[PDB]
Amino acid sequence: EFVPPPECPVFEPSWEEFTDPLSFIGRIRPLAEKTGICKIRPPKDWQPPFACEVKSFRFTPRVQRLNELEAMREAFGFEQAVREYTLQSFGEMADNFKSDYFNMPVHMVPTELVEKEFWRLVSSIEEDVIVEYGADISSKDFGSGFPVKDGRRKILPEEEEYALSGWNLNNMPVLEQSVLAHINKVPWLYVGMCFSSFCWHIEDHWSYSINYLHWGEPKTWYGVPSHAAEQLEEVMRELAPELFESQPDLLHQLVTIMNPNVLMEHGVPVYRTNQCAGEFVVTFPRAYHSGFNQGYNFAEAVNFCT
Ligand SMILES: C[C@H](OCCN1CCCCC1)c1cnn(-c2cc(C(=O)O)ccn2)c1-c1cccc(-c2ccccc2)c1
Ligand SMILES: [Mn+2]
């Protein structure tokens, strides 16, 4: 069965250390860059409100078949596809799926069991599980999960500090330095369900990324330090299908699903974490990462530069 990778570092900064995100990330970098990903728990009293317009939040999630690669059928390409949800109707669907699958209330399912079942389903040719992921939803559509002082929604006085916080993902620096920037991005939202996932990838321009789970069940992460990036790519090339082996990385990254134990068997260091509600995950430059959701949750993410 699946062997869980060792845990990535978790930081619990003081109020003093929590003042500037880039300053804090610079200081933890000697350790966190050696694990690729790390988790940051804000001070207990730091609780931003959820500012998305939930009334009109409607979306069509992407259909994901967990075992599509291992499955390499009559009328293929028409198995399942788009259907619009609200945040509420998606959550009802998500909870019903998980509780029916495990035959228990969703919050009683151990995280280690969903993890073991996810990787079993990914490689199983006998059971075909299909889930849905409301993801790559632009925050410019229904607003950010964080309050923003843009004059499009009410902000109570006690929420102003979160609209102005450096840990508000809308306030991260995103402009990359270049001479082209002298001659010449927004957060994305992720509505997960049980087993919805993201495959192994790095960010464009090898950027940092920062990720906040606003609410819901945990998001399980795997990360690989940047010094092992080429080792992971070599393992990918050896074990990937021949038809996908020669594809450009940006396209190959669409189907780069691989059990972490396989990477670990080849000597690639992999670290894991369960990002719970109210916690940040930071990925460092060229740190490959992948993961899946334990249940109905809501995440916000952006690439930033230092
Ligand atoms: C590379 C990719 O660019 C997304 C920007 N797009 C904007 C629109 C045009 C096209 C590019 C990207 C970046 N970050 N990122 C990610 C996501 C999570 C998460 O899901 O929590 C955690 C950590 N990182 C991912 C990602 C990686 C693999 C898979 C999926 C995915 C698959 C199917 C359905 C939904 C999402 C997303
Ligand atoms: Mn990413």
Determined by X-ray
Residue minimizing CA distance to atom 22 of ligand 1: 198
The response to whether 133 counts as a known ligand-binding position is yes
Ligand nearest to the CA of 291: 1
For the residues of 232-274, what is the DSSP string, one character each?
HHHHHHHHS-HHHHTS-HHHHTTS----HHHHHHTT---EEEE
Is 219 in contact with 294 (CB distance < 8 Å)?
Answer: yes
Q: Tokens standing for 242?
A: 């021949």
Residue minimizing CA distance to atom 17 of ligand 1: 198
Element (H, E) at 85: strand 85-86
For this experimental structure, what is the resolution in angstroms?
Answer: 2.0
- What are the chain's domains? 1-306 (2.60.120.650)
Helices (H), the chain: 21-32, 87-102, 111-123, 139-142, 160-163, 180-183, 229-239, 242-245, 249-252, 260-265
3-state secondary structure 283-298: ECCCCCEEEEECCCEE
Nearest atom (ligand 1) to Cα of 199: 28
Q: Which residues contact 184 (CB under 8 A, 6 or more apart)?
A: none
